[model samples]
Target: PKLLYCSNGGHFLRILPDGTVDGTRDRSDPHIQLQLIAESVGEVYIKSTETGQYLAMDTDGLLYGSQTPNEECLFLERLEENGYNTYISKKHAEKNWFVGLKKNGSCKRGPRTHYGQKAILFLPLPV
Candidate 1:
């Protein structure tokens, strides 16, 4: 009943401090993008690609779709320990885990609205 989160052709897996599988491993097939957020009271926010609205993950892990172009789906969590880092895509980690947000001089940008202006396009985590 343990979950194993894997990425990068099974080259990486989510491990606990003791090196045991605590998350589900994602198969390298199908190419679903993934990201990780590590911090105290951390949250993972995702925006919809089609509707351009924020998709919120409920307690059942379902995304509630919206129509706002800049909506964000936030995955908020509290950590028992501080300074523990979660593994996301290299691109995401480089940007300090703020995915889908606009950066200076980058051709890719956020939406041009008051809300739901930014949608997250994430790279799958490395295994």
Candidate 2:
């Protein structure tokens, strides 16, 4: 199953699948496609449907939208409460830079804990 992980429970994090990551106001927009490929137990690669690129975090914990299968894009989802989940890069667990939105409506490698993080939400998607 796929998941629509909205940023701040408002905007859907848009992935251009070509290294362009941002946030969109349209929550139900089909363009913001994420293919949840299980890498491990909780870790998965948020692959793009448009370009087939997986969401990756480089050495700086920055979200580089498109990439081949690697360790960088492996994201671990945390179930904080209820059914909501926060996505953090597996490589940099210490930073806890879960994927979130910036002020400019762009995707940010947010350096904050998942605890009560207002910028995360989980919505299941069909295959």
Candidate 3:
């Protein structure tokens, strides 16, 4: 498990017990721990270490928690030119849906996100 920190907001990604996915500024929050399950060299699945749910993006670009892993749960992990990472939904890569966090530390719906957005950039940190 690792912590995905958003440099723009100085926050970490987290999935609540009820399956709501969001961002938190607290470094010690257990919900911020995530397991990176790689499907290939660049594709991966993000699972919450706390809730045991897989992070998924819907067709509408909404991020959610899934009990089972599927195509929607897969993401293309890439390091941007800025050195931060972006997680774009493999299933919706054609549409360019990137996992995102708003400036206020809330979840940004995937469909509304873009590769150029700072809200979608992250830095992987140790557990």
Candidate 4:
């Protein structure tokens, strides 16, 4: 899957060389290619196709790359009425944590984000 942000100029999500996550405007960027492995109905594991690292969220709502998929790597994928999707932390979902990006093309702390924010809306496309 290629996860695209609805905001920040519609950039594609990327896993950098250092195993960090970010966004890039380049549509053809190989790092944007991801594997959304289904763990259950509406649950998934997001792994970087280029770096082979799993995307994870910490207790503080910080996003990072993980070598091994764990509980923190689990995400609850949900589609919205706006024709976009949101990935909420399976671990912190009770706190309403969501995966989001800032206008400057950086990851947003999940606790500070919500479903309605444009930064949290995403489009998952075929790789």
User: At residue 72, what lDDT does model 4 achieve?
Assistant: 95
Across residues 35-85, which tens digit of lDDT does each residue of candidate 2 receive? 888866998888877777788877765777765778788888877656767
Which 10 successive residues of model 1 have the least lDDT summed? Answer: 105-114
Any runs in candidate 1 off by more than 4 Å, and if so which?
1-26, 36-41, 46-55, 58-61, 64-72, 79-127
What's the residue-level lDDT of 123 in candidate 4?
86
**TM-score of each prediction:** 0.26, 0.80, 0.94, 0.92
Count steric clashes of candidate 2: 1
For lDDT, the strongest prediction is 3
Task: Between candidates 1 and 2, name the one with more favorable lDDT.
Answer: 2
Q: lDDT values of the candidates?
A: 0.28, 0.68, 0.89, 0.83
lDDT of 1 by residue, 13-77 (tens): 22222212122234442212223332234544333222334433223322234343222344443
Error of 1 at 47 (Å): 6.1
Candidates sorted by lDDT, descending order? 3, 4, 2, 1
Alpha-carbon RMSD, each predicted model? 16.7, 2.6, 1.1, 1.4
As a whole number from 0 to 100, the lDDT of residue 101 in candidate 1 is 21
Candidate with maximal TM-score: 3
Per-structure clash totals for the candidates: 25, 1, 2, 0
